[PDB]
Write a protein that binds this ligand. Structure first.
Ligand SMILES: [Zn+2]
Lengths: 50, 107, 33, 49, 400
């Protein structure tokens, strides 16, 4: 909620995207993961073809 | 095709223990002795007969008429047809020519 | 006949970007948490 | 998800008057959502569109 | 689509509301009914409704394998005990059925009896599903086996034998039976037809469709944890009932900067008094060239500062009032250099011009929207009020 005028006092860039953490001085980003849905019927052909 | 006992609702079996065979359950004493015909089956299964006549087997199948190729037409390939899978599916035909060093054979 | 074209459809995109869109997923998820 | 403009009987739901209103500031995006002018679509649902 | 035929009426019979049951046999074709075979015994429990129905079986008929039946009876019943036997003879004389409940609540199901020109409805007391039971094999197995030979936290609630014991608590009830062939069935059938006048205006069913939709789609949230202060933009086209009209005008003039009078009655709608809104408007706007513009202080509260990425400064509305007075004095302001008069940075001047003016090439800035017939609305008095109020504000502003 700060305006750029106040951003200037904190030594931050108004254009900065944010959304990361600062831990011991380094900026860390928790990336988006990807995975299959649960509770779904899957029909699959075995390595033997069954 | 399958039958179920009306008395208890289970698959029945055929057995003989008297003058005539009978359709019988096994958890309830229901018996229905068979006395007429039925006209349907489970469609049995035996594998691909390919080389039982391979090569030049019994020459009783010599035939006269044959088709011809659209390109070359030397005197040696009389006609043929065969079948695909089972009782109630279509029957395929291929027309194949062979002298040497190619891979021609039509469908 | 030429079906008439809404020339300003694209103006919806800046409107959408004002509340959602870029980098807002991380912040919304953390806020909910 | 993705937003799309709804179409009925070969005319888009949105109209130049809505765009003029949005430019002037009378309405915002969520107004388009509530008046059934646009809607989100998921991968599974847009299989049927 | 006009009506064609058979505008049949419907009536509700409460005679058997707690007395009707619906049995069904998933394993039996509907063409093979049970009425032919005599029934012998039945049991029921009132709570957790379940039944045990005992069915006689023909033995004289040839399809009964007598040898197999004797073997089964020997396997299940004592060789010569016969004191408490599942069957009286040395062959099975009966087979048993057991019931399974389908759904806990049956309020939305009803049994309808058709009749010429009329339908008679009745609520069901329950629905049950009947299957043949194979427990005699278990009894035979048990007989074969008997012939062969600071406590921790309780978790007995979830155990099956708990429920078995709880069901066993309920005492059994024995029932008499009458088949469909008995005239007793037809006699009892009379109770479905509820008596009364054919045409009656029901006292209930007063809810209009809006109330019905409200009733069967209850609001998702009974009470919200926060109040809609709405400092930022919110749903606008819906005139929120919780939002008083004065604040409606406030937020609307905060969103759109300059706006003629007509669009106000266009947006609020004709339901609101057109005279009362004048009050809010004069608290929140003034006629430049016959069109309202929002105060500077509404956009610039006294506790704020220049938010734009140019030069921070103390909140100075006076520049906005100055350019606004210039717009009142002339149709369009040629002065690029308003900064020379009011001493802000050029970017602030351009921002101030942006809200209410548009650029014309080599011709300065022009008021964004044109003049109007301000006298059509019969308030020249408020026009004069604004006029000498602006005379006073100009006198104040002339100090700098
Ligand atoms: Zn059986």
């Amino acid at each position: 909620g700060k305006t750029p005028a106040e951003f200037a006092k904190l030594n931050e860039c108004p254009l900065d995207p944010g959304g990361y953490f600062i831990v011991k001085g380094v900026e860390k980003v928790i990336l988006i993961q990807e995975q299959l849905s649960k509770n779904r019927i899957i029909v699959e052909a075995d390595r033997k073809g069954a | 095709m399958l039958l179920f006992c009306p008395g208890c609702g289970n698959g029945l079996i055929v057995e003989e223990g008297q003058r005539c065979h009978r359709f019988s359950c096994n958890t309830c004493p229901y018996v229905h002795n068979i006395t007429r015909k039925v006209t349907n089956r489970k469609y049995p299964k035996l594998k691909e007969v390919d080389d039982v006549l391979g090569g030049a087997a019994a020459w009783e199948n010599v035939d006269s008429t044959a088709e011809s190729c659209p390109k070359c037409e030397h005197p040696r390939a009389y006609f043929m047809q065969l079948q695909t899978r089972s009782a109630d599916e279509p029957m395929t035909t291929f027309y194949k020519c062979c002298n040497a060093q190619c891979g021609h054979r039509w469908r | 006949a030429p079906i008439p074209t809404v020339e300003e459809k694209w103006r919806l995109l800046p409107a959408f970007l004002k509340v959602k869109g870029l980098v807002k997923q991380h912040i919304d998820s953390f806020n909910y948490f | 998800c993705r937003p799309y403009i709804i179409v009925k009987k070969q005319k888009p739901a949105v109209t130049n008057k809505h765009m003029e209103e949005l430019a002037q500031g009378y309405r915002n995006f969520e107004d388009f959502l509530h008046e059934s002018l646009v809607e989100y679509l998921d991968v599974n649902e847009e299989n049927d569109c | 689509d006009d009506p064609v035929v058979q505008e049949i009426d419907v009536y509700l019979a409460k005679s058997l509301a707690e007395k009707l049951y619906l049995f069904q046999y998933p394993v039996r074709p509907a063409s093979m009914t049970y009425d032919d075979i005599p029934h012998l015994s039945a049991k029921i429990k009132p709570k957790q409704q379940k039944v045990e129905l005992e069915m006689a079986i023909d033995t004289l008929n040839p399809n009964y394998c007598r040898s197999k039946g004797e073997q089964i009876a020997l396997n299940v019943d004592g060789a010569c005990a016969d004191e408490t036997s599942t069957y009286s003879s040395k062959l099975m004389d009966k087979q048993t059925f057991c019931s399974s409940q389908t759904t806990s609540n049956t309020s939305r199901y009803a049994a309808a009896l058709y009749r010429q020109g009329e339908l008679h409805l009745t609520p069901l007391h329950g629905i049950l599903q009947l299957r043949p039971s194979f427990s005699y094999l278990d009894k035979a197995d048990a007989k074969h086996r008997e012939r062969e030979a600071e406590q921790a936290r309780q978790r007995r609630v979830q155990s099956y034998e708990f429920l078995q014991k709880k069901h066993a608590e309920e005492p059994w009830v024995h029932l008499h039976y009458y088949g469909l062939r008995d005239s007793r069935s037809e006699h009892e059938r009379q109770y479905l037809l509820c008596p009364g006048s054919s045409g009656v205006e029901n006292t209930e069913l007063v809810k209009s469709p809006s109330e019905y939709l409200m009733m069967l789609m209850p609001p998702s949230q009974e009470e919200e944890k926060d109040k809609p202060v709405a400092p930022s933009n919110v749903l606008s086209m819906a005139q929120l009932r919780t939002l008083p009209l004065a604040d409606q005008i406030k937020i609307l003039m905060k969103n759109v900067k300059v706006m003629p009078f007509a669009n106000l009655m266009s947006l609020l709608g004709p339901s609101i008094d057109s005279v009362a809104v004048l009050r809010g408007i004069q608290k929140v706007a003034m006629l430049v060239q016959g069109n309202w513009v929002v105060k500077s202080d509404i956009l610039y509260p006294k506790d704020s500062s220049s938010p734009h990425s140019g030069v921070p400064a103390e909140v100075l509305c006076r520049g906005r009032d100055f350019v606004m007075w210039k717009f009142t004095q002339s149709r369009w302001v040629v002065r690029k250099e308003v900064a020379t008069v009011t001493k802000l940075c050029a970017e602030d001047v351009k921002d101030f011009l942006e809200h209410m003016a548009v650029v014309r090439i080599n011709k300065g800035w022009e008021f964004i929207l044109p003049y109007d017939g301000e006298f059509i609305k019969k308030h020249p008095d408020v026009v004069q009020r604004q006029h000498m109020l602006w005379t006073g504000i100009q006198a104040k502003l002339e100090k700098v």
